[PDB]
Design a protein around this ligand. Structure first.
Ligand SMILES: *[C@@H]1O[C@H](CO[C@@H]2O[C@@H](C)[C@@H](O)[C@@H](O)[C@@H]2O)[C@@H](O[C@@H]2O[C@H](CO)[C@@H](O[C@@H]3O[C@H](CO[C@H]4O[C@H](CO)[C@@H](O)[C@H](O)[C@@H]4O)[C@@H](O)[C@H](O[C@H]4O[C@H](CO)[C@@H](O)[C@H](O)[C@@H]4O)[C@@H]3O)[C@H](O)[C@H]2NC(C)=O)[C@H](O)[C@H]1NC(C)=O
Ligand SMILES: CCCCCCCC/C=C\CCCCCCCC(=O)OC[C@H](COP(=O)(O)OCC[N+](C)(C)C)OC(=O)CCCCCCC/C=C\CCCCCCCC
Ligand SMILES: CCCCCCCC/C=C\CCCCCCCC(=O)OC[C@H](COP(=O)(O)OCC[N+](C)(C)C)OC(=O)CCCCCCC/C=C\CCCCCCCC
Ligand SMILES: CCCCCCCC/C=C\CCCCCCCC(=O)OC[C@H](COP(=O)(O)OCC[N+](C)(C)C)OC(=O)CCCCCCC/C=C\CCCCCCCC
Ligand SMILES: CCCCCCCC/C=C\CCCCCCCC(=O)OC[C@H](COP(=O)(O)OCC[N+](C)(C)C)OC(=O)CCCCCCC/C=C\CCCCCCCC
Ligand SMILES: CCCCCCCC/C=C\CCCCCCCC(=O)OC[C@H](COP(=O)(O)OCC[N+](C)(C)C)OC(=O)CCCCCCC/C=C\CCCCCCCC
Ligand SMILES: CCCCCCCC/C=C\CCCCCCCC(=O)OC[C@H](COP(=O)(O)OCC[N+](C)(C)C)OC(=O)CCCCCCC/C=C\CCCCCCCC
Ligand SMILES: CCCCCCCC/C=C\CCCCCCCC(=O)OC[C@H](COP(=O)(O)OCC[N+](C)(C)C)OC(=O)CCCCCCC/C=C\CCCCCCCC
Ligand SMILES: CCCCCCCC/C=C\CCCCCCCC(=O)OC[C@H](COP(=O)(O)OCC[N+](C)(C)C)OC(=O)CCCCCCC/C=C\CCCCCCCC
Ligand SMILES: C[C@@H]1O[C@@H](O[C@H]2C[C@@H](O)[C@]3(CO)[C@H]4[C@H](O)C[C@]5(C)[C@@H](C6=CC(=O)OC6)CC[C@]5(O)[C@@H]4CC[C@]3(O)C2)[C@H](O)[C@H](O)[C@H]1O
Ligand SMILES: *[C@@H]1O[C@H](CO)[C@@H](O[C@@H]2O[C@H](CO)[C@@H](O)[C@H](O)[C@H]2NC(C)=O)[C@H](O)[C@H]1NC(C)=O
Ligand SMILES: CC(C)CCC[C@@H](C)[C@H]1CC[C@H]2[C@@H]3CC=C4C[C@@H](O)CC[C@]4(C)[C@H]3CC[C@]12C
Ligand SMILES: CC(C)CCC[C@@H](C)[C@H]1CC[C@H]2[C@@H]3CC=C4C[C@@H](O)CC[C@]4(C)[C@H]3CC[C@]12C
Ligand SMILES: [Mg+2]
Ligand SMILES: [Mg+2]
Ligand SMILES: [Mg+2]
Lengths: 294, 993, 40
């Protein structure tokens, strides 16, 4: 048994078959699998011929845009000691990774960058989604616009003395026009003052009614000094039609934060084509658990 | 319970005297025992009743059904699933509950299968309990010189016991005085006729002597006395029953096939796991993860639904059997008949009817044959001559037996008749084609009868003649043909009379040897018209002197008789021989009768010859002929007792038509074992207690239902409630049919394996988003798939199944490498490619091209990256990309169903084409329709993306798997074509299951 | 088109589910018909 089914010397068999058999079977499987591979590849090429390079055919799984931020929180919690420096390094490293892309050295010349209104403005259509005109042009977004959180002055961005910052960002969608709420009698309380039509508002608050008191003064930084995103930076023509494109950003400083206690802060954007989800906690809004323990 | 002392052949103290007997057990031959002494012994050793069987509680067999070989594999699978869940709970936070679901599901599968399998064996046990009809019985014992009837349970060793024709022998008696007493030794020893019990001793073998009455036997006619020698379980049939219970059970062929099947499934499962474990450790992953990968791949390679499918498969073929009156106690005993290659049968009660019947008749220098079949389905014998009428008057008058009161309902052959077996057979034949004997008998009044004498060797009687024109006297007499031939001088030829010249005397001698050589017993009937001038109507012929002329009578004709075989016995034996099944007769009857029945049923084909037949045809001694020139052999039991192991092997190895005669039950067991030692499956068909040790050790026992004994009925595996023997042919046919279908269904449930594991393998090696989820694999293996696999059982034959030779056990298996090469190698591969095709299509239409998917799982899974760039530059949140992955699981599952369509069609037939066999199987059609409706239901019903995580599909996706399916169909069609045109070629020894 | 291109982000899943159920139902019935056709 053990020995024979391995190698017998009368029938000159190895494992069961002869020399010419292992070859007939190996050759058959090689030809068979080769044909299988060629067929799968052909059916995948016709699939590549069925899609366009300048636009995703289906854009419904990304209709209501998200609201992400600069720090990378594991459980949406920002916890660090104001004494131990090796505590907020993971935050500054990320923040830096994000702002490191808005460097002026990167944004230079006429191509492919263009100077836009220093004050919020309206949409800008650079034509259709074609290759007729070459690479479209995107508006420049300066670092300095974000005043106390830019890492140009206080590299750390705040985390050094109990005053962290949080750079919010709107998820990039192709052909998406942000639309703000109009001035009519139904509008939230908050939004009434400073209604620049051209600005998509971002306003943070506290999840529970108690926590209001323990969160101090939310100081937002942005284009024009407003707490929102200027409509002039839209729409997005996609990577292929607009490489070197920068999306607006909004900084939020949580000054006067109570020490040694977990604070739940929910930030939210307001607008027509913006809708939230009870299942996805990043669709339009976002949550952060700040705790400056020192 | 020493088995070797129970395996030995019975010994006894028969060869003794009445004084030695009374001196050994202690007993008055004329006064019996004393009541005080009787009770002293009754309390000293135990009542004269066999021990009850070893009761089997129901929770024991329920736990039995919960275990086994397949259910055990599913048990270890559930255990592994919970182990991997524990590790994920103690090692990581937010552990997914996929594994805990899969484990409770596997446990439920095992429990449900156990409940169903247990319920069936209980059903059979209830209908089995409705047959033990036990009416208490009381014996007649003589104590202190008085006759008393006491319960059978109070008889002891030593007292005097009297029996009477119609009662049952209580214990093992030693006859001391008899009065023409006969007993039926059919169940214990196998003797078709009633052996007379005489106080004198005759043979060295206790079963052959006449001075011993046995347990469970019955006294047909006469009365006798005897001293109880053996009592209780220590009796003959007691040692036989105890031996039967103390024999092992075995392990059927279907079970061994399932075991070797699990052997292969685990071989390839632990191979893929230990290998992708070293491979994952070589790619950087940590140990904690690799262990989960090993368990996941091994558990993934376990068929969870093949258990329920196989159980339902086996269950379906058993109902077909219960419809034709063939009941199986276990569930796998349904396949053993088809795999049998050597059937050892019994003669008395199985091959025959154990009822004496008038077979052949002599009259008008011509042999006439009568119908000797249970339901009377045959040829009449020409009832138009006067000779036959006179014969009917002779037999119907010169006969003293009469039907038992109250049989006005049963048929003419199955009713009870009080008398000898010869007068009963004659009475039944006359009552059969001559109408009511009761009026035939009152139509002619019997005046004087001289009973059968040991010296006269004849039975005669005179009666009045019902001729209203002839008032003479009729005289009739029957007896041995030689004695009656010496008393005639005329012959009733075609009605008229003629002299007895030597021409007809020689025709009578050849007729005597013709009916005699047929193994039948012949009798002669003659009559004469007494002259009313010498014996007027008033003269009384008192039975004292010669009042009737002994000689000068008128011989009318001979009448033979023998126990005939059951209706479908010859046809069934022929059908079994046609299927290549060796039929070997094994019986404890006289060889002169066994050989005749063998030739009459087909065991000894007409033309074949024994060594004695050759010595008789040549007129030379038997020690000169060579035994190789003899195809058939008759082995006597006395000679069987003195034979080595090799000799029996050679007996079965050189003789094709074997008949074992005069073999004891222990020898029957030895013969069955001699058949197994080589390597063939054995099926023993019997009825009495002597067959109990033979039916138990055989691979499959078949007991008769009406004519069988309770012990052999409880020790058998299959019961024939109608006593029809053709059911054996039906069984051997179904046993094959249900085998080729299991092969097809297994290849079906194994083909889906590959498109179920490949997604995960490419997930770990290529780092692409998970293609096939867990609740989808479950919706495939335990949902859609079940109905089609169950339907594959309803497939009809392709070629004649009752024509091919029996499957070789050592080479043709149930699951070979030729199947694995198809399911795991060729079809499953195409199905996996089709699934991946639909996958890439879904992700390419939403924005994730194939070049950007390789290398993303680390960020595609991360729960905190709300900005994942796709091939076009769009930013996708975490929940948004997860919805697409789930929709990819839904379409992958639908692709599986689409390719399963062509797999269920190419699995329908193994060799033949679809345009030949045909889609006449309505269940398979229903399986396809339902399989599609369920997939559409699981995707389109609201709240499924919440409960099961399956999102709706856009109508253009459903068509991504169609080309792969058509290709599967064309490939298998050309496959099943070269096999037909090219028999024995490469495609056959490489791809033919 | 232009600014009010809201349709480019909408899909009528409702109507799709309704139709897919109608179809599933029909296939289910047909199945039953085939299964019991002969036992009557
Ligand atoms: C985008 O801008 C980033 C900042 O640019 C600076 O400020 C802008 C406004 C301009 O003025 C520009 O010209 C400036 O450079 C730019 O990142 C910067 O890159 C330089 C070059 O590597 C870094 O300088 C090095 O600093 C380290 C120590 O850094 C400490 O502070 C930083 C935070 O600022 C911490 O992250 C560190 O852990 C340290 O705590 C020095 O040790 C190092 O020494 C090297 O140079 C000296 C000579 O000066 C040599 O003798 C040595 O051998 C070394 O070769 C450098 O001095 C600078 O830290 C870094 N800034 C930040 C904030 O990290 C970024 O690269 C730009 N990106 C793109 C894509 O354009
Ligand atoms: C991300 C990538 C995806 C990866 C997916 C992988 C999916 C896995 C798919 C298939 C699993 C394959 C595993 C091997 C299966 C072998 C089947 C097997 O073991 O079945 C058992 C048979 C027994 O059969 P029986 O009962 O009829 O025997 C009767 C003998 N009597 C009667 C004479 C006594 O035993 C035999 O066949 C004898 C054993 C023969 C073993 C051959 C081993 C070949 C394995 C690999 C070869 C690779 C080489 C590649 C290089 C080629 C050169 C270019
Ligand atoms: C691009 C897309 C790729 C898709 C690939 C997957 C395809 C798989 C699905 C279907 C394949 C269909 C194959 C068609 C085969 C037809 C064969 C045929 O017709 O052979 C004729 C037979 C032979 O007759 P005979 O001479 O032996 O008769 C003797 C009568 N005497 C005895 C009285 C004389 O006749 C008979 O079988 C009797 C009549 C039977 C009629 C059957 C009709 C039903 C056929 C298919 C059902 C549809 C399933 C659809 C599944 C989708 C669900 C949504
Ligand atoms: C011969 C014999 C023939 C017999 C044929 C029988 C066929 C039976 C056919 C149909 C009955 C199927 C069951 C019906 C289920 C109704 C569920 C329902 O009406 O849900 C409506 C609501 C959805 O509301 P919404 O849109 O506001 O939710 C918004 C949620 N947001 C916004 C958070 C995402 O549900 C919810 O909320 C909660 C959802 C609860 C989930 C229940 C689903 C059950 C799960 C598995 C069982 C399926 C096993 C397969 C059996 C196959 C049998 C053949
Ligand atoms: C004859 C033909 C038969 C055809 C039938 C097809 C056979 C199906 C075979 C296997 C499928 C069974 C697998 C069971 C899956 C259970 C999944 C489960 O328990 O998931 C737990 C989820 C939790 O999810 P999460 O963490 O995302 O929640 C986050 C919530 N936050 C974030 C808002 C807090 O809770 C929920 O979904 C809550 C809703 C609970 C839904 C239970 C549905 C049970 C479905 C089937 C069981 C009965 C089948 C019996 C039929 C056998 C047929 C032979
Ligand atoms: C022998 C076995 C026989 C088996 C027969 C089984 C019976 C089959 C039962 C039903 C199938 C018919 C289904 C018809 C449904 C049409 C419904 C409809 O209105 O659907 C429109 C969609 C277009 O969707 P969209 O995404 O463009 O718009 C989405 C727009 N929103 C989402 C905004 C609303 O279209 C679709 O679903 C296309 C529907 C699929 C088209 C049917 C293709 C038939 C394929 C082969 C048969 C060829 C037979 C040749 C005859 C030979 C005779 C000898
Ligand atoms: C993209 C391409 C689409 C093409 C569509 C083509 C459709 C063609 C339509 C019908 C096919 C023709 C009808 C065939 C009737 C043949 C009748 C016959 O007498 O046959 C007998 C021969 C077998 O002879 P033998 O010597 O081996 O017998 C040996 C017997 N012994 C072993 C006892 C000695 O049978 C054979 O050769 C059968 C071998 C036929 C293999 C060809 C399979 C064609 C593939 C698909 C058909 C379409 C069905 C599915 C519909 C999908 C709709 C979307
Ligand atoms: C998306 C999925 C697509 C899948 C498509 C798969 C297509 C690939 C199909 C077949 C390619 C494999 C061809 C292999 C040829 C080399 C094999 C070889 O070296 O073989 C040698 C033998 C000759 O040796 P011997 O027997 O004389 O020696 C006796 C020796 N002793 C005793 C061991 C028997 O060869 C022979 O016997 C001849 C046997 C040749 C094998 C015929 C198999 C044909 C199967 C399928 C073709 C149909 C494609 C239909 C597709 C329609 C697409 C729309
Ligand atoms: C012997 C002869 C036998 C014959 C038997 C015939 C049986 C009857 C046959 C067919 C009945 C058809 C019923 C059609 C029901 C339409 C319901 C429907 O279209 O509901 C759709 C909407 C949910 O849309 P959504 O906006 O949430 O979409 C998600 C959007 N997102 C995720 C993007 C946000 O519903 C809702 O809101 C409210 C839903 C309320 C619950 C409705 C329950 C329907 C469930 C099962 C019935 C279907 C069984 C069919 C038979 C199949 C047998 C296997
Ligand atoms: C690399 C690794 O990937 C992820 O985990 C992976 C391992 C493990 O977690 C599971 C869930 O337990 C596995 C499980 O083991 C085996 C399966 C039950 C298996 C079977 C189907 C079947 O029928 O029988 C067996 C096929 C895949 C499977 O269905 C799941 C799929 C989800 C996954 O989650 C994947 C996590 O992201 C993890 O954090 C990261 O380390
Ligand atoms: C920041 O919060 C502090 C409280 O932590 C506020 O200062 C307190 O004001 C009360 C009077 O209302 C005094 O009794 C406390 O002594 C003050 N505490 C400190 C530490 O100054 C302060 O007004 C808040 N400032 C802003 C801008 O919100
Ligand atoms: C019936 C079977 C054997 C035919 C299989 C044909 C195979 C070999 C054919 C079908 C489609 C073909 C591919 C189609 C498209 C491309 C893209 C091009 O930029 C390079 C060649 C490449 C990659 C082809 C290579 C060969 C290919 C895969
Ligand atoms: C015997 C063979 C050839 C029949 C093949 C029938 C196929 C083509 C049928 C069976 C089930 C059908 C699908 C069932 C359900 C739906 C959902 C509906 O909203 C659009 C049509 C769509 C997507 C159907 C398209 C055609 C389909 C896939
Ligand atoms: Mg018998
Ligand atoms: Mg048995
Ligand atoms: Mg499986």
């Amino acid at each position: 048994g053990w020995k024979k089914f391995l190698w017998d010397s009368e029938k000159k068999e190895f494992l069961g078959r002869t020399g010419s058999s292992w070859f007939k079977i190996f050759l058959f499987y090689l030809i068979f699998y080769g044909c299988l591979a060629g067929i799968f590849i052909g059916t995948i090429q016709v699939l590549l011929l069925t899609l366009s390079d300048f636009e995703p055919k289906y854009q419904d799984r990304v209709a209501p845009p998200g609201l992400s931020h600069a720090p990378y929180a594991i459980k949406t919690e920002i916890s660090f000691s104001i004494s131990n420096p090796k505590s907020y390094e993971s935050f500054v490293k990320s923040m830096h990774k994000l702002m490191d892309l808005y460097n002026e050295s990167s944004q230079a010349g006429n191509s492919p960058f263009e100077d836009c209104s220093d004050t919020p403005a309206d949409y800008i259509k650079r034509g259709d989604l074609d290759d007729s005109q070459g690479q479209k042009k995107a508006c420049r977004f300066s670092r300095m616009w974000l005043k106390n959180c830019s890492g140009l002055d206080d590299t750390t961005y705040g985390y050094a003395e109990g005053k962290p910052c949080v750079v919010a960002k709107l998820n990039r969608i192709i052909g998406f026009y942000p639309k703000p709420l109009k001035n009519t009698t139904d509008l939230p309380e908050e939004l009434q003052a400073n209604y620049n039509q051209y600005v998509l508002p971002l306003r943070c608050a506290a999840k529970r009614e108690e926590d209001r008191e323990k969160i101090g003064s939310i100081e937002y930084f942005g284009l024009g000094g407003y707490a929102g995103f200027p409509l002039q930076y839209y729409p997005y023509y996609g990577k292929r039609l607009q490489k070197k494109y920068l999306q607006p950003l909004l900084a939020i400083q949580f000054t006067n934060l109570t020490q040694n206690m977990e604070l739940r802060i929910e930030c939210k954007v307001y607008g027509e084509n913006i809708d939230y989800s009870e299942k996805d906690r990043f669709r339009g809004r976002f949550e952060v658990k700040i705790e400056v323990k020192s | 319970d020493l088995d070797e002392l129970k395996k030995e052949v019975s010994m006894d103290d028969h060869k003794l005297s009445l004084d030695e007997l009374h001196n050994k057990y202690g007993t008055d031959l004329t006064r019996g025992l004393t009541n005080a002494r009787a009770k002293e012994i009754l309390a000293r050793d135990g009542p004269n009743s066999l021990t009850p069987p070893p009761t089997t509680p129901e929770w024991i067999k329920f736990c039995r059904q919960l275990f086994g070989g397949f259910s055990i594999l599913l048990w270890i699978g559930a255990i592994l699933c919970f182990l991997a869940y524990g590790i994920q709970a103690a090692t990581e936070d937010e552990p997914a509950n996929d594994n805990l679901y899969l484990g409770v599901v596997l446990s439920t599968v095992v429990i449900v299968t156990g409940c169903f399998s247990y319920y069936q064996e209980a059903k059979s046990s209830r209908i089995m309990d409705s047959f033990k009809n036990m009416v208490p019985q009381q014996a007649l014992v003589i104590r202190d010189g008085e006759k008393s009837t006491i319960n059978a349970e109070f008889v002891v060793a030593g007292d005097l016991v009297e029996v009477k024709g119609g009662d049952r022998i209580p214990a093992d008696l030693r006859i001391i005085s008899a009065h023409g007493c006969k007993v039926d030794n059919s169940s214990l020893t196998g003797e078709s006729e009633p052996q007379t019990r005489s106080p004198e001793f005759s043979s060295e073998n206790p079963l052959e002597t006449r001075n011993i009455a046995f347990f469970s036997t019955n006294c047909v006619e006469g009365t006798a006395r005897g001293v109880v020698v053996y009592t209780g379980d220590r009796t003959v049939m007691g040692r036989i029953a105890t031996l039967a219970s103390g024999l092992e059970v075995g392990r059927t062929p279907i079970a061994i096939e399932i075991e070797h099947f699990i052997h292969i499934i685990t071989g390839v499962a632990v191979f893929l796991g230990v290998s992708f474990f070293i491979l994952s450790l070589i790619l950087g992953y940590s140990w904690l993860e690799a262990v989960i990968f090993l368990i996941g791949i091994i558990v993934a390679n376990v068929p969870e639904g093949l258990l329920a499918t196989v159980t339902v498969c086996l269950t379906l073929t058993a109902k077909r059997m219960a419809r034709k009156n063939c009941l199986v106690k276990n569930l796998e005993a349904v396949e053993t008949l088809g795999s049998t290659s050597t059937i050892c049968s019994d003669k008395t009660g199985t091959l025959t009817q154990n009822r004496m019947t008038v077979a052949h008749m002599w009259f008008d220098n011509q042999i006439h044959e009568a119908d000797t079949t249970e339901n009377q389905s045959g040829a009449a014998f020409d009832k138009t001559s006067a000779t036959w009428s006179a014969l009917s008057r002779i037999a119907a008058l010169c006969n003293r037996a009469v039907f038992q009161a109250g049989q006005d309902n049963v048929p003419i052959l199955k009713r009870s008749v009080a008398g000898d077996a010869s007068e009963s057979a004659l009475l039944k034949c006359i009552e059969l084609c001559c109408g009511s004997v009761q009026g035939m008998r009152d139509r002619n009044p019997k005046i004087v009868e001289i009973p059968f004498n040991s010296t006269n060797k004849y039975q005669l009687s005179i009666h009045e003649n019902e001729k209203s024109s002839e008032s003479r006297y009729l005289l009739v007499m029957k007896g041995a043909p030689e004695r009656i031939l010496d008393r005639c001088s005329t012959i009733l030829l075609n009605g008229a009379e003629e002299p007895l010249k030597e021409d007809m005397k020689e025709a009578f001698q050849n007729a005597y040897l013709e009916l005699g050589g047929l193994g039948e017993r012949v009798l002669g009937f003659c009559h004469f018209a007494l002259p009313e001038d010498k014996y007027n109507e008033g003269y009384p012929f008192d039975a004292d002197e010669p009042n009737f002329p002994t000689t000068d009578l008128c011989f009318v004709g001979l009448m033979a008789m023998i126990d005939p075989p059951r209706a479908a016995v010859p046809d069934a034996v022929g059908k079994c021989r046609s299927a290549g099944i060796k039929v070997i007769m094994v019986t404890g009857d006289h060889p002169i009768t066994a050989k005749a029945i063998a030739k009459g049923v087909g065991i000894i084909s007409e033309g074949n010859e024994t060594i004695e037949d050759i010595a008789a045809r040549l007129n030379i001694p038997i020690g000169q002929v060579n035994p190789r020139d003899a195809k058939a052999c008759v082995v006597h039991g006395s000679d069987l007792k003195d034979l080595s192991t090799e000799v029996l092997d050679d007996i079965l190895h050189y003789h094709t038509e074997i008949v074992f005669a005069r073999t004891s039950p222990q020898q029957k067991l030895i013969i069955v074992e001699g058949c197994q030692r080589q390597g063939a499956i054995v099926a023993v068909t019997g009825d009495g207690v002597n067959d109990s040790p033979a039916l138990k050790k055989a691979d499959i026992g078949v007991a008769m239902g009406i004519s069988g004994s309770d012990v052999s009925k409880q020790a058998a595996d299959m019961i024939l409630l109608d006593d029809n023997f053709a059911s054996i042919v039906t069984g051997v046919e179904e046993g094959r049919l249900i085998f080729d279908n299991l092969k097809k269904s297994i290849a079906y449930t194994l083909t889906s394996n590959i498109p179920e594991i490949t997604p995960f393998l490419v997930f770990i090696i290529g780092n692409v988003p998970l293609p096939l989820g867990t609740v989808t694999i479950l919706c495939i293996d335990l949902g859609t798939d079940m109905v089609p696999a169950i339907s594959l059982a309803y497939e009809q034959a392709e070629s004649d199944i009752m024509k091919r030779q029996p499957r070789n056990p050592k080479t043709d298996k149930l699951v070979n490498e030729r199947l694995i090469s198809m399911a795991y190698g060729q079809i499953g591969m195409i199905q996996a490619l089709g699934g991946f095709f639909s996958y890439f299509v879904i992700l390419a239409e939403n924005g994730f091209l194939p070049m950007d998917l390789i290398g993303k799982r680390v960020r595609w899974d991360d729960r905190w990256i709300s900005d994942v760039e796709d091939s076009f530059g769009q930013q996708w949140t975490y929940e948004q990309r997860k919805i697409v992955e789930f929709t990819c699981h839904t379409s992958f599952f639908i692709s599986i169903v689409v390719v399963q369509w062509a797999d269920l069609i190419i699995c329908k037939t193994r060799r033949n084409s679809i345009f030949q066999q045909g889609m006449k199987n309505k269940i398979l059609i229903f399986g396809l329709f339902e399989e599609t409706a369920l997939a559409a239901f699981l995707s389109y019903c609201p709240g499924t993306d919440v409960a099961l995580r399956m999102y709706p599909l856009k109508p253009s996706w459903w068509f991504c798997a169609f080309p792969y399916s058509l290709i599967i169909f064309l490939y298998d069609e050309m496959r099943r074509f070269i096999i037909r045109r090219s028999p024995g070629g490469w495609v056959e020894q490489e791809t033919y299951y | 088109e232009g600014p009010d291109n809201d349709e480019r982000f909408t899909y009528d899943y409702y109507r799709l589910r309704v139709v897919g159920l109608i179809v599933a139902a029909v296939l289910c019935v047909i199945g039953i018909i085939i299964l019991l056709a002969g036992k009557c």
